[PDB]
Each structure stands twice: as C-alpha cells, then as structure tokens.
C-alpha cells in the first residue's frame, strides 16, 4: 500500500522574507478504506471540486448518496484541523482545491449463478482525498467569446509560413 497524502501535510516551509506575498495555507486530508464505490465517490468528488467549503458542505448535506455523509465528515475534519493545527483563521475562508477518489484493497467472494456456475464478486473499497486551500475560490472559466475566437483565428492565419519553399 501507499500512504503519502498523510506525509504531504508534514512539510515545513522556510520563513518568508518581508515583502513576499503571504503564502496560502494548504491542508491535505483523506479517508481510507471506505466501503462505498470508487466511481460513485468520484461523482461526488467532482461535484464538490473548486467551490468554497461552506458551499460544498451545503451540497453534500442534501445529496442523497451514501458517500455524501463520508465526504461531509472528511471536509469537517479537514476544516477543524486547518483551524486548530495550521495557522488558519476565518474557518470559512477555505476552498476545495483538490477532491479525488481512488480504489483501495478489495475482498473476493463467490456469487452463485445456477447450473453449478459461479462468479467472482468483488467487495469494493475506496479512498477519498481532499486538499483545501485558504482563500476565496478561483473564478470559473468563462466560455470563449466571439472576439477571442476571431483573435485566435486571425493569429493562426498570420502564423502561416510558406512551407517547403526556400
């Protein structure tokens, strides 16, 4: 097995010289060996990506999935650790920078079929990784506008060269 999400939270940065902008706080947390399925948890992880922690908790409270409560508990634990251990004031000033679900160690059982046949039933377990960053959430990317599209088209037209010519 691999355990590096735990160790990513134990790094220490050198003190910042005066004049340098303040470095945002990064908090890594994860829950290991969750009975809920990997792809089903990926759906919720993608759902709560990039939003504020309060908004993520609001969505997960009313989500009907079984993994919604697990993700909510993980987010609450991460918020509590960010407030207590790391020097992070304004417990509402965190946003979910990363939210991922991976697969853990499975259990193999027998699924009986009929005519004496069987199948390999696999008891799935998943890990949920979350990374929170202090600060307001970054703005969502807007769809490319007509002016930008025309600008890129004109630039690609001007980038042309006479190939196989000289």
């Amino acid at each position: 097995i691999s355990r590096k999400w735990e160790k990513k939270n134990k790094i220490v940065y050198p003190p910042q010289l005066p004049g340098e902008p303040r470095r945002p706080a990064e908090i890594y947390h994860c829950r290991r060996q969750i009975k809920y399925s990997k792809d089903k948890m990926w759906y919720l992880a993608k759902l709560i990506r990039g939003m504020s922690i309060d908004q993520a908790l609001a969505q997960l409270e009313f989500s009907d999935k079984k993994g919604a409560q697990i993700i909510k508990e993980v987010l609450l634990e991460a918020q509590d650790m960010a407030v207590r251990d790391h020097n992070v004031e304004f417990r509402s000033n965190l946003y979910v920078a990363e939210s991922t679900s991976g697969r853990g160690q499975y259990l193999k059982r027998i699924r009986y079929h009929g005519r004496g046949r069987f199948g390999i039933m696999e008891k799935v377990f998943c890990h949920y990784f979350v990374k929170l960053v202090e600060g307001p959430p970054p703005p969502r990317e807007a769809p490319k506008t007509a002016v930008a599209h025309a600008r890129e088209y004109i630039q690609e037209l001007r980038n042309r060269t006479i190939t196989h010519a000289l």
């Binding site: 193999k108 027998i110 005519r115 004496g116 046949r117 069987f118």
Partner: peptide, 14 residues
C-alpha cells in the same frame, strides 16, 4: 451421444 460438462467449483480458500 448426450455429452455434458459438469461445472468445477473454485477452491474454497480463495
């Protein structure tokens, strides 16, 4: 001939 293939069960330990 009535040829039939009896299913073979996987070992119980796995």
């Amino acid at each position: 001939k009535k040829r039939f293939t009896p299913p073979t069960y996987q070992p119980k330990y796995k």
